[PDB]
Design a protein around this ligand. Structure first.
Ligand SMILES: O=C(O)c1ccccc1NC[C@@H](O)[C@H](O)[C@H](O)COP(=O)(O)O
Ligand SMILES: O=C(O)c1ccccc1NC[C@@H](O)[C@H](O)[C@H](O)COP(=O)(O)O
Ligand SMILES: O=C(O)c1ccccc1NC[C@@H](O)[C@H](O)[C@H](O)COP(=O)(O)O
Ligand SMILES: O=C(O)c1ccccc1NC[C@@H](O)[C@H](O)[C@H](O)COP(=O)(O)O
Lengths: 470, 461
């Protein structure tokens, strides 16, 4: 008969005596106040795309997420991308403890949120003693009087409150109680169903001036970009802590699966990764001004091993020879073949060569009117499509209305993408951008002409970081 | 005849100006965004505030190549835990720097970023802002009052803070008249490359009391920080950090000192100790101890937090070889004191031979047992560290090599630090007391935050 939330809360009630004993030696009235404002960190406008990233090793819906749990290493990664860090403090269902909260508080500069099922002042005291700047209070668990009493306890220590609402009645209660941060949970915490539409619905009732946090179930940038317009912030956990490389997962979520292609130096790769790129492209084609030797290629990979490197070529065979330690994919940039059946054989030959640990991408010239047709036909035979102008490195666009809706979730958009047209490129709705000459130094830059322009990399990724559909 | 090192650097940089002008010729300078991070506000936390500007520097005139495998993004991630600012060398010919390094750091870190360049032309100020700087260095050793004011006015167009570098009384007077808000006292003479660590104390008598004073260069250890801290808002530290393989461990060692959290019995305690600032973690191998750790628990703690140097602690006089697993940095001989000095030296020699030359050897001495003090001085040269359980005429030799132990707690930490040992050995004073139920004797994460906050800004008076 008990729901998941009722089980969790009754479990937490049974922890209160242990928590009281754990901090019985602490002088609660002398506790230092929090000096980090989660409100001011999240209060950057609807569309501001602030992330609260969550340290979570396990959950009722997923089970064990991250067995080898280093909250301090996760917090260091989160300190690059996030505007707040959420730490599960609940032990029986989430693998959490107050030691995780303290580890995160000492590791990060960000405001730290104790994510707990709070029903008693002792949990507020514990939160502050172990380093929290904010607590979660849930209107699904607390009546108005219990909420005010715990909110007043939080106010004693300058703890911000994330006020969790799941419906129209909780929104009206939160307004009456003077909530400043509304947390809309997409997850129904009784039956664990997800409704991503819940934040759009409740944003109609939540005050225009209030901070709105969209929590739970956000797995990809397309969701971020759909929800961005009515959200100050996202709370995101398992999409990050389920991946071996948390820093790559954060970039893939916040920015998307974007490639900075034509890398020819170690420092360009480090700049691309710092800025937020997931993929680095290395060109293996004699005719290209961006061509790299085996020597450069290994120097770039060693200097910045946190990109996924794509070996790009126009060849139709010999992809085997482009492979080294760190190559995540090959991008077949050959001209369009005679038939769909020859594209499918070209792809299966390369997949044979590179083996099953190495992805196979296909560039399609959409400058051709046959491009759209090959794209839909080969979509299921490749890991990614590049939808490109001419035959690569042109720095020119094609008609972006030419991209079929079918393939977008598998596609990087390519061809003259620059800081000036980035917003318009993101609006096409492909999973990612392929970025090359549009962030290069132009022809008048002297010996720097054609090298990656670190200032152009800062601008385009800042544009990407807050893009949402209008 | 031969130009000084500073003269060669400045003239080399004059020869790069054509390359820089072309590199940013496509940039609309008038429309550059302003910096929104204040180095001034970050550093303006009082004399003794111990704010660090940590420097990304891969090479110097004085040291040659410091860090060949250079990842400014990974170093900035480490620095973002400890620092109140990040300095990035942009000078390419002697310091291995580039504006890409500046941009990588600006994109990686939340902190105000300082372009560390020899600035002589407005193009360098424009480039600094475009590649993400929040602050620039202007050197009164390089610029006359007119050159400085033209460059400081360019800087003010973009909300760039200025680190005004001064080396003598003449330069501080000029800096006051020019309206400088941040005084960078270089301990290093850039003509003869000599270091005078006493120069920040001397120029602090002439620098306005309400002004930010940054003590730059030559700071290698926490004893120097604690000595200079009283007259400093901040320290700028580079090669002590970038010359070490593990920059996070070197940052902790410099900011907090070589402190140990002993008697670790859980993975979360070790993670908390490392996050708080600890360099060493102690693991006890004694069946008598409530802090005794199994083989299995030992390997869980090390794997959960591999960024502490682990110290195997035992009362045994032999059998130190079968305490060694991967991650064991040191052994701590916690045997009851032997009959004489010679039996102590011989106990230590025998432990050296068991663990071999890759494993440090530490000796715990009880300072009550009055032969204790004599043994300490006798064996100091034969151990890598002492653990000392007077303090008026305990030699400076013994102090520099010692962790002070004896119920160190959040309440007495400042008094312990005033003794002047290199480090603190912290155990029961950060444990939950007997009334904590199942938590009795585990490490109190809240006590670790408090004691390390006190260490972080301790200076001598
Ligand atoms: O996540 C669950 O399975 C669950 C179950 C019952 C009660 C609460 C739950 N979630 C806790 C909540 O803090 C979520 O972890 C965050 O909102 C992050 O959601 P995520 O991005 O991992 O889907
Ligand atoms: O860029 C090159 O020189 C080159 C040469 C041969 C094959 C592919 C090449 N380009 C890699 C390709 O993914 C490019 O990143 C895209 O075509 C976008 O280039 P852009 O038009 O932005 O300069
Ligand atoms: O450090 C040098 O060798 C040198 C030589 C000539 C001119 C300037 C120099 N130093 C640049 C200066 O920014 C220093 O790197 C910082 O003050 C950090 O000093 P450190 O802590 O590395 O001794
Ligand atoms: O702590 C123990 O139980 C133990 C047991 C056997 C041998 C040595 C032990 N202690 C480790 C030692 O490094 C201690 O940190 C110091 O002696 C200081 O202990 P304190 O008095 O601060 O608890």
């Amino acid at each position: 008969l008990p729901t998941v939330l009722e089980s969790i809360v009754e479990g937490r009630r049974g922890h209160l005596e242990e928590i009281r004993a754990r901090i019985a030696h602490v002088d609660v009235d002398a506790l230092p106040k929090s000096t980090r404002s989660l409100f001011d960190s999240l209060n950057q406008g609807r569309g501001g795309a602030r992330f609260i990233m969550e340290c979570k090793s396990a959950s009722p819906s997923l089970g064990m997420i991250r067995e080898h749990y280093q909250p301090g290493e996760i917090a260091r990664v989160y300190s690059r991308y996030a505007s707040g860090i959420s730490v599960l403090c609940e032990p029986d269902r989430f693998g959490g403890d107050y030691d995780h909260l303290a580890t995160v508080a000492a590791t990060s500069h960000l405001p730290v949120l104790c994510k707990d099922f709070i029903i008693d002042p002792v949990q507020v005291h514990a939160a502050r003693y172990f380093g929290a700047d904010a607590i979660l209070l849930m209107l699904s668990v607390l009546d108005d009087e219990e909420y005010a009493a715990l909110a007043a306890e939080a106010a004693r220590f300058d703890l911000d409150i994330l006020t969790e609402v799941i419906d129209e009645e909780e929104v009206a209660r939160a307004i009456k109680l003077g909530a400043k941060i509304f947390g809309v949970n997409h997850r129904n915490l009784h039956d664990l169903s997800i409704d991503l539409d819940r934040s759009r619905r409740l944003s109609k009732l939540i005050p225009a001036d209030a901070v709105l946090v969209s929590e739970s179930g956000v797995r990809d940038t397309e969701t971020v970009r759909q929800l961005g317009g009515h959200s100050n912030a996202f709370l995101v956990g398992s999409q990050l802590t389920s991946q071996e490389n948390v820093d790559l997962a954060a970039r893939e979520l916040v920015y998307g699966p974007n490639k900075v292609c034509g890398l020819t130096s170690p420092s360009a790769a480090q700049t691309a990764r710092a800025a937020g790129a997931v993929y680095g492209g290395l060109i293996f084609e004699e005719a290209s001004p961006r061509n790299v030797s085996r020597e450069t290629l290994q120097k770039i990979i060693a200097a910045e091993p946190n990109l996924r490197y794509v070996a790009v070529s126009r060849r139709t065979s010999g992809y085997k020879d482009l492979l080294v330690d760190g190559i995540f994919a090959v991008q077949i940039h050959a001209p369009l073949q005679d038939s769909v059946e020859a594209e499918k054989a070209l792809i299966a030959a390369v997949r044979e060569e590179v083996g099953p640990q190495v992805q196979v991408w296909r560039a399609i010239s959409m400058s051709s009117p046959l491009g759209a047709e090959v794209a839909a036909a080969v979509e299921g035979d490749v890991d990614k499509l590049i939808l490109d102008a001419h035959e690569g490195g042109s720095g020119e666009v094609f008609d972006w209305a030419t991209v079929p809706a079918a393939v977008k979730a598998k596609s990087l958009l390519a061809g003259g993408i620059s800081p000036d047209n980035a917003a318009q490129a993101l609006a096409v709705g492909c999973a990612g951008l392929d970025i090359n000459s549009g962030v290069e130094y132009p022809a008048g830059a002297g010996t720097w002409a054609g090298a990656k322009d670190a200032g152009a990399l800062l601008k385009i990724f800042a544009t990407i970081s807050t893009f949402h559909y209008l």
